[PDB]
Amino acid sequence: LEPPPSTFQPLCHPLVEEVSKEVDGYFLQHWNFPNEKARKKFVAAGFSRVTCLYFPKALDDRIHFACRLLTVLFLIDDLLEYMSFEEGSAYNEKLIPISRGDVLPDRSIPVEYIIYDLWESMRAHDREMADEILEPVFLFMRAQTDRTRARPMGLGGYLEYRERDVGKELLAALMRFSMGLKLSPSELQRVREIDANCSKHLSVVNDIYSYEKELYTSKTAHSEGGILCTSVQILAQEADVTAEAAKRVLFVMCREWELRHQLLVARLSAEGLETPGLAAYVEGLEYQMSGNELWSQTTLRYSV
Amino acid sequence: LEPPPSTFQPLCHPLVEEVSKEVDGYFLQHWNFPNEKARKKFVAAGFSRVTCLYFPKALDDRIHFACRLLTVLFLIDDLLEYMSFEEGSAYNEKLIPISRGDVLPDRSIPVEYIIYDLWESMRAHDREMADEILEPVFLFMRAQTDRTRARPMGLGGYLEYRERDVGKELLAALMRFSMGLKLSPSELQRVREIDANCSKHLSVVNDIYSYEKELYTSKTAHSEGGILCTSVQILAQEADVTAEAAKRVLFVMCREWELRHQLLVARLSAEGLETPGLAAYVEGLEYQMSGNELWSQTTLRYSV
Numbered sequence A, B: 001l002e003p004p005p006s007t008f009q010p011l012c013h014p015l016v017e018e019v020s021k022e023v024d025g026y027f028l029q030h031w032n033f034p035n036e037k038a039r040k041k042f043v044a045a046g047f048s049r050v051t052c053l054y055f056p057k058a059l060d061d062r063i064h065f066a067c068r069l070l071t072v073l074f075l076i077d078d079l080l081e082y083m084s085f086e087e088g089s090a091y092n093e094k095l096i097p098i099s100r101g102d103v104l105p106d107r108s109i110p111v112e113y114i115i116y117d118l119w120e121s122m123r124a125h126d127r128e129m130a131d132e133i134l135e136p137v138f139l140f141m142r143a144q145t146d147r148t149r150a151r152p153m154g155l156g157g158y159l160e161y162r163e164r165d166v167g168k169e170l171l172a173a174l175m176r177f178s179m180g181l182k183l184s185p186s187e188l189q190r191v192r193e194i195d196a197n198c199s200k201h202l203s204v205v206n207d208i209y210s211y212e213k214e215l216y217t218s219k220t221a222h223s224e225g226g227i228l229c230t231s232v233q234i235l236a237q238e239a240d241v242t243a244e245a246a247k248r249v250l251f252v253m254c255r256e257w258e259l260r261h262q263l264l265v266a267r268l269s270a271e272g273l274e275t276p277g278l279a280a281y282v283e284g285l286e287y288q289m290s291g292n293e294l295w296s297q298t299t300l301r302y303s304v
């Protein structure tokens, strides 16, 4: 699959090597893997590497928080594929009061105390910004087991749903936390169209590279949890082409979304609405798009 | 607008110029054009040229029949844009028993006697092959004023409707008539998938090039008859991109349909199911797709 030309230059956080070893090492000690093969596959995924590609301008003392969060969510994301929608919902809902810190974790259950200790440490570093990630994460978690996954969706309906299932808002709040980048409610409101456009890029780029993984999952995992829910399958179905043909077409659309990102950013500046914070923000969103693509093209999670 | 590479090479019927003058001349003599500007625009469209590009291997004494049919359908196609769905339906339904030869035409009304004389002349030349064009034409006519045009559609839903509105079936029966290519019901059943694939190509290629014409029509003509119903609008709405962005993506999809055409034809041959008639037929479909693109690229109908 040859990617069409992009003007975006992907950037990686300079501390990616040490943070990856730190965070991978943490999960290897605490997380319950089924076997040595799974432990190797975990490291092979490079979960801290995505994070460092998503937020390359995160503060040096905050990047590890982001790596820990995306890592545990990735691990949960895989676990949910072997559960029903009901079981998956129960699993996630239990982690929500724990994430808030309102309920103590069962220290014998790794996922419970990993989540608790993480959010506690994040609030310890920056309480105000850590709290602003809470609701976006919960929105993402509840989307993962949404019944709409078991209903037919057009491309438009899917992308609207997938903004939550891909965790667009959490990525936004996580990015701001990691950068210590604060925005007023007025600034946040102004870039909503830019956010929605970015979400489609992230979602479809992931759909493109994770298709083989998710096709296999749909044939082997739970009938509900492993369900095939992706723009690749939808376009292939609607246009009556192969999945690989759908990928090539979708990749072209992703480049159009990149063009639209630049247009919207230019218009924000052409109008009076550009601020230093917003400039850093929309630039950060570009890194998410290019970083997500670079990681997707190289991670063993999708190629194996 | 840069067309992505294609391996389909267009062919034109050798007698295109002489038949154009004959068919253009007939309509200029009989059809009720409002003024000289409309008569010039009519000639500028090249309705016989597209027909000769659609069926370049039509028999020398049958190509004019195809040119007449497509020309009169094109003329009605524009007429319908100033009518409501109701008026458009009543207009078309009147012509249907006339086309069958069951109802005599009003000789003071050009469209009625032109359509009557056409079908009578076609039945005289080849009774059986002419009759097999009737219902496909009627299916197309009724799709033109279908109220599904004014209702929400996804890409898949549009394409399945478009197959009727683009007259894929009538074109196939017209091609067979023009070439004297007779196929058994079983043979035709073998290439159903190939027909469906070809329909999408013809539809979207037309949508891409005729968008500006149809955008203008939607803003100037009847809100119903001139309604903007096209893949360019649908995809742009689904993916939240501009029409120009949608065009570029759709053009890539068109090339995927070309690849699929070659795949399906290759499979048909390998299974020992490609009869000499079927070989001529599927080649004929390729001429339709390539011929449609060449004409769309150059006709003044879409450029002015």
Ligand SMILES: C=C(C)[C@H]1CC[C@@]2(C)CCC[NH+]=C2C1
Pocket (backbone or CB within 6 Å): A050, A070, A073, A074, A077, A165, A166, A167, A171, A202, A206, A292
């Ligand atoms: C952890 C997840 C599965 C969510 C957050 C990260 C992100 C965007 C990385 C790419 C794959 N999907 C997701 C969703």
Ligand SMILES: C=C(C)[C@H]1CC[C@@]2(C)CCC[NH+]=C2C1
Pocket (backbone or CB within 6 Å): B070, B073, B074, B077, B165, B166, B167, B171, B202, B206
């Ligand atoms: C006459 C028509 C409007 C129908 C038949 C010819 C064909 C495919 C040529 C291209 C434009 N539209 C059509 C539809």
Ligand SMILES: [Mg+2]
Pocket (backbone or CB within 6 Å): A077, A078
């Ligand atoms: Mg997943």
Ligand SMILES: [Mg+2]
Pocket (backbone or CB within 6 Å): A077, A144, A165
């Ligand atoms: Mg998921």
Ligand SMILES: [Mg+2]
Pocket (backbone or CB within 6 Å): A206, A207, A210, A211, A214
């Ligand atoms: Mg995926």
Ligand SMILES: [Mg+2]
Pocket (backbone or CB within 6 Å): B077, B078
């Ligand atoms: Mg038209």
Ligand SMILES: [Mg+2]
Pocket (backbone or CB within 6 Å): B077, B144, B165
């Ligand atoms: Mg039409």
Ligand SMILES: [Mg+2]
Pocket (backbone or CB within 6 Å): B206, B207, B210, B211, B214
């Ligand atoms: Mg058109």
